[PDB]
Design an enzyme around this catalytic site. Structure first.
Site, PDB file in Angstrom:
ATOM      1  N   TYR A   1      -2.315 -10.202   4.835  1.00 55.27           N
ATOM      2  CA  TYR A   1      -2.279  -8.776   5.146  1.00 55.27           C
ATOM      3  C   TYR A   1      -3.718  -8.287   5.293  1.00 55.27           C
ATOM      4  O   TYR A   1      -4.486  -8.256   4.326  1.00 55.27           O
ATOM      5  CB  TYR A   1      -1.496  -8.017   4.079  1.00 55.27           C
ATOM      6  CG  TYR A   1      -1.512  -6.505   4.176  1.00 55.27           C
ATOM      7  CD1 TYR A   1      -1.819  -5.836   5.364  1.00 55.27           C
ATOM      8  CD2 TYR A   1      -1.205  -5.738   3.063  1.00 55.27           C
ATOM      9  CE1 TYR A   1      -1.833  -4.444   5.428  1.00 55.27           C
ATOM     10  CE2 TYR A   1      -1.203  -4.352   3.118  1.00 55.27           C
ATOM     11  CZ  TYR A   1      -1.518  -3.710   4.280  1.00 55.27           C
ATOM     12  OH  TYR A   1      -1.506  -2.327   4.254  1.00 55.27           O
TER      13      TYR A   1
ATOM     14  N   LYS B   1       0.082  -9.721   8.622  1.00 56.23           N
ATOM     15  CA  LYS B   1       0.392  -8.339   8.883  1.00 56.23           C
ATOM     16  C   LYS B   1      -0.902  -7.628   9.275  1.00 56.23           C
ATOM     17  O   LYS B   1      -1.927  -7.778   8.418  1.00 56.23           O
ATOM     18  CB  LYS B   1       1.030  -7.622   7.675  1.00 56.23           C
ATOM     19  CG  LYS B   1       1.044  -6.115   7.803  1.00 56.23           C
ATOM     20  CD  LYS B   1       1.480  -5.488   6.498  1.00 56.23           C
ATOM     21  CE  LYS B   1       1.489  -3.956   6.563  1.00 56.23           C
ATOM     22  NZ  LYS B   1       1.668  -3.346   5.260  1.00 56.23           N
TER      23      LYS B   1
ATOM     24  N   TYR C   1     -12.380  -3.799  -2.291  1.00 57.20           N
ATOM     25  CA  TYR C   1     -13.491  -3.359  -3.138  1.00 57.20           C
ATOM     26  C   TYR C   1     -14.561  -4.431  -3.373  1.00 57.20           C
ATOM     27  O   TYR C   1     -15.764  -4.155  -3.195  1.00 57.20           O
ATOM     28  CB  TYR C   1     -12.967  -2.830  -4.486  1.00 57.20           C
ATOM     29  CG  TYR C   1     -14.041  -2.271  -5.413  1.00 57.20           C
ATOM     30  CD1 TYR C   1     -14.940  -1.294  -4.973  1.00 57.20           C
ATOM     31  CD2 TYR C   1     -14.142  -2.708  -6.741  1.00 57.20           C
ATOM     32  CE1 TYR C   1     -15.925  -0.778  -5.820  1.00 57.20           C
ATOM     33  CE2 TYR C   1     -15.117  -2.201  -7.603  1.00 57.20           C
ATOM     34  CZ  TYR C   1     -16.019  -1.237  -7.137  1.00 57.20           C
ATOM     35  OH  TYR C   1     -16.997  -0.716  -7.987  1.00 57.20           O
TER      36      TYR C   1
ATOM     37  N   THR D   1       0.830  -1.204   0.000  1.00 57.96           N
ATOM     38  CA  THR D   1       0.000   0.000   0.000  1.00 57.96           C
ATOM     39  C   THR D   1       0.862   1.251   0.000  1.00 57.96           C
ATOM     40  O   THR D   1       0.607   2.191  -0.765  1.00 57.96           O
ATOM     41  CB  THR D   1      -0.927   0.033   1.218  1.00 57.96           C
ATOM     42  OG1 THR D   1      -1.408  -1.286   1.516  1.00 57.96           O
ATOM     43  CG2 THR D   1      -2.115   0.970   0.958  1.00 57.96           C
ATOM     44  N   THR D   2       1.903   1.263   0.843  1.00 57.54           N
ATOM     45  CA  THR D   2       2.782   2.418   0.968  1.00 57.54           C
ATOM     46  C   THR D   2       3.557   2.678  -0.322  1.00 57.54           C
ATOM     47  O   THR D   2       3.979   3.815  -0.577  1.00 57.54           O
ATOM     48  CB  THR D   2       3.744   2.201   2.153  1.00 57.54           C
ATOM     49  OG1 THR D   2       2.997   1.903   3.340  1.00 57.54           O
ATOM     50  CG2 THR D   2       4.618   3.435   2.419  1.00 57.54           C
TER      51      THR D   2
ATOM     52  N   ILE E   1       5.891  -4.351   9.723  1.00 60.14           N
ATOM     53  CA  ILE E   1       6.018  -3.870   8.357  1.00 60.14           C
ATOM     54  C   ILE E   1       5.597  -2.411   8.440  1.00 60.14           C
ATOM     55  O   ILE E   1       4.407  -2.101   8.580  1.00 60.14           O
ATOM     56  CB  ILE E   1       5.187  -4.685   7.358  1.00 60.14           C
ATOM     57  CG1 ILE E   1       5.835  -6.071   7.196  1.00 60.14           C
ATOM     58  CG2 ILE E   1       5.092  -3.945   5.986  1.00 60.14           C
ATOM     59  CD1 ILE E   1       4.968  -7.106   6.468  1.00 60.14           C
TER      60      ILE E   1
ATOM     61  N   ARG F   1      -8.970  -0.079   4.475  1.00 59.04           N
ATOM     62  CA  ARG F   1      -8.667   0.160   3.071  1.00 59.04           C
ATOM     63  C   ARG F   1      -9.395  -0.807   2.149  1.00 59.04           C
ATOM     64  O   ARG F   1      -9.853  -0.396   1.076  1.00 59.04           O
ATOM     65  CB  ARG F   1      -7.159   0.053   2.827  1.00 59.04           C
ATOM     66  CG  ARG F   1      -6.317   1.130   3.497  1.00 59.04           C
ATOM     67  CD  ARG F   1      -6.818   2.539   3.160  1.00 59.04           C
ATOM     68  NE  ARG F   1      -5.857   3.580   3.538  1.00 59.04           N
ATOM     69  CZ  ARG F   1      -4.833   3.971   2.773  1.00 59.04           C
ATOM     70  NH1 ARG F   1      -4.626   3.415   1.575  1.00 59.04           N
ATOM     71  NH2 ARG F   1      -4.004   4.916   3.210  1.00 59.04           N
TER      72      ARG F   1
END
Ligand SMILES: N[C@@H](CCCC[NH3+])C(=O)O
Ligand SMILES: N[C@@H](CCCC[NH3+])C(=O)O
Ligand SMILES: [Mg+2]
Lengths: 296, 296
Positions: free
Chosen positions: A135, A164, A109, A45-46, A205, A140
Site C-alpha cells: 500500500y 494499492k 514518519y 487509513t479510512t 480499495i 500520508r
C-alpha cells in the site's frame, strides 16, 4: 498466486461515546456485502488505524472476518505499521484469526530507504502464508515504494501479489504493469478508479464505496469485463463526490457523509481527527444530493 | 512561560542484540553533558521513536532524566504521537518521571486539519504543567502546523512555549517571529541552525550534535551571545557533515557516523530502518575526516 481483487471498501470505524461501535461496524460491513462489494478492508487509513489501540484494531479485524463468513466477500485486513515488528504482529494475528489476506501500508514518519522497505515487506510476507497487498500513499507516509521495489517484492516473495496505489501517478501505474503485468494493481484513489482499471488494474480499495457501494461495485465489475464505456460513465458521474470526500483529510468527509446519510449515529472521530468545518459540512451535504444513497 | 532552549541533542537510541543498550545510552548522554549541551531530547525522530515499544520509550526517558539529574542539563522528552490519547499518555509519563518538558511531533500519517492539530495540542498541554515544544516536520508527517495554529496555541495554552521547525522554510521562521516574537523558535534542521538563530531563534534540537556536541553547542552559544560571525563560521564548517547526515533518512547516517567514530558498539537499527548503502557508508566516513570528534 492467491489474490484478493475486485471492488473493495476501506471501512470507516464508527465510534459511540469514544469506543468502537461494534454493532454499527458489523451492520456497515453487512451493508457492503449486500451491495456487491468483493472484499472489505478493516482498519486502513479510512478506518482510523492510527488512533485505535492494538486491541481495538484486532477486534475490528475479527468483526470483519466473522461478518463475511458464509459469503463470497473476503477480508483484506489492515495490518500495516511503521514498525516492522508491529506489522509482523498484525500480519500473524490476521492470519490466525481468519483474514483472507492483509493490506500493509508503507511505513509512515520514519521514512525507510528502499532497501529498508524491501526488508520490511519481506519480513511481513515471510511471517504468514496469506496474500499481502502493498500500500503506497506517499502524501500520508512521507516515503514512496518505488516501482523497482514493488516489482522486486512481487517477484521475490510468494504472497506479495500487488499494490494499492494512492499516489495520483498514472505514469507509475503504466510503469508497474508494463514491466510486471502479473501483479494486481489496486486503485487507492477513487477519482481515478477507471483510468487505473482501464490500464489493467484489477480492483479498487475505495473510500466512496462506504457511501455508494453499489456504484463503486458496478464501476469495477464493468471495467473488469472491459465494458469501458459503462465503467467510465460511472467514474465520471462519481467525480464530484469522489473529490468532495477529500475536501478535508480522509476519513473526515466520508464519516460526515455517512452521518448525513443516517448510516452512523454520531459524527465522532478520535483526536487528532475532528469534525469538518461548518462550510465543508455544507459542501458535502450539497454534493450528496446528487446521488442515490442505499440504506440498510 | 517556562522554557527549555539553547543547544539540544536529538539522542540516537543504540541497540545491542535488538534491545536498547541502556548503558551506552547513559554514556552518550554524559558525553553530551560534558560538551556544553543544554538539554537532551530522548526518543525523538532521531531516537527511532516509531520502533520502540511503549516500555522502551519510557525507559529511555527515565535514563535521560537520571543521567541529567544533579546537572545543569535539562530533559525535553520526546512525547509525540499521531494519536492524541497516546501523546497525552507520554506527556503525563514525562511529567511524572521528572522530565523538564516535552517535545511533541505533529501527528504523522493521519493528517489532521488545523483545528484537529489545535485540539490535539490543547489536550496535550492541559494534561501536564511542564513546558511543551511543538514540532513541525512536514516531510515526515504529511501535515503542517500552520504559523497561525502555532501562534494561537502559544497564546492560548500557557505551557506551549515554541516550536521545533524542520521544514526548510526560513520565510515561515520570519513569519513566526515577526508576528509572535515571544515564542521560542528552535531549529530542527542542522544545516540552517545559524539562519534560524540569527533571526531570533533560541536553540537547536540537533542530529549533528550527537557526533559533534561541542561544535553545535558553540554555534548555539555564539549566536545567542550575538557573535553572529563566529556562529556563522561554525555553521559553514558543519555544512558538509550536516548535509551528509541526511544522504539517507535520519537517523541512518548519524548512527553510521557514531559507529564509525567508535561511540556505539554495533551499527544496529530496528526495521524498517537498516544500514546505509555501501556507497553512502563510505561517503559518510569520508566527510567525518574533516571534523575532530570528541571521545568519551
Ligand atoms: N498510533 C500508532 C499506533 C497504532 C496501533 C494500532 N493500529 C500508529 O499509528 O502507528
Ligand atoms: N510505531 C507506532 C508506535 C510507537 C510507540 C512508541 N513511540 C508509532 O510510530 O506511532
Ligand atoms: Mg461481466
Amino acid at each position: 498466486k492467491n489474490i484478493i481483487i475486485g471492488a473493495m471498501t476501506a471501512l470507516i470505524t464508527p465510534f459511540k461515546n469514544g469506543k468502537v461501535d461494534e454493532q454499527s461496524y458489523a451492520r456497515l460491513i453487512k451493508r457492503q456485502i449486500e451491495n456487491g462489494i468483493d472484499a472489505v478492508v478493516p482498519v486502513g487509513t479510512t478506518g482510523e488505524s492510527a488512533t485505535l489501540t492494538a486491541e481495538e484494531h484486532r477486534t475490528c479485524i475479527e468483526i470483519a472476518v466473522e461478518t463475511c463468513k458464509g459469503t463470497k466477500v473476503k477480508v483484506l485486513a489492515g495490518a500495516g505499521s511503521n514498525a516492522t515488528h508491529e506489522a509482523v504482529g498484525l500480519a500473524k494475528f490476521a492470519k490466525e484469526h481468519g483474514a483472507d489476506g492483509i493490506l500493509s501500508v508503507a511505513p509512515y514518519y520514519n521514512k525507510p530507504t528502499q532497501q529498508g522497505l524491501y526488508e520490511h515487506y519481506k519480513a511481513i510476507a515471510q511471517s504468514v502464508d496469506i496474500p499481502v497487498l502493498l500500500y503506497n500513499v506517499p502524501g500520508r507516509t512521507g516515503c514512496e515504494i518505488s516501482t523497482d521495489t514493488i516489482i522486486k517484492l512481487f517477484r521475490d516473495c510468494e504472497n506479495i501479489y500487488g499494490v494499492k496505489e494512492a499516489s495520483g501517478n498514472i505514469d507509475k501505474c503504466v510503469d508497474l504493469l508494463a514491466h510486471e503485468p502479473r501483479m494486481m494493481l489496486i486503485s487507492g484513489e477513487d477519482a481515478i478508479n477507471y483510468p487505473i482499471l482501464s490500464n489493467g488494474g484489477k480492483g479498487v480499495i475505495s473510500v466512496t464505496s462506504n457511501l455508494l457501494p453499489d456504484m463503486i461495485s458496478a464501476l469495477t465489475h464493468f471495467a473488469l469485463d472491459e465494458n469501458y464505456k459503462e465503467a467510465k460513465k460511472i467514474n465520471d458521474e462519481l467525480y464530484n463526490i469522489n473529490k468532495i470526500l477529500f475536501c478535508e483529510s480522509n476519513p473526515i468527509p466520508i464519516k460526515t457523509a455517512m452521518y448525513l446519510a443516517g448510516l452512523i449515529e454520531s459524527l465522532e472521530f478520535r483526536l487528532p481527527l475532528c469534525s469538518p468545518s461548518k462550510e465543508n459540512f455544507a459542501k458535502i451535504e450539497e454534493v450528496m444530493k446528487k446521488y442515490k444513497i442505499k440504506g440498510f
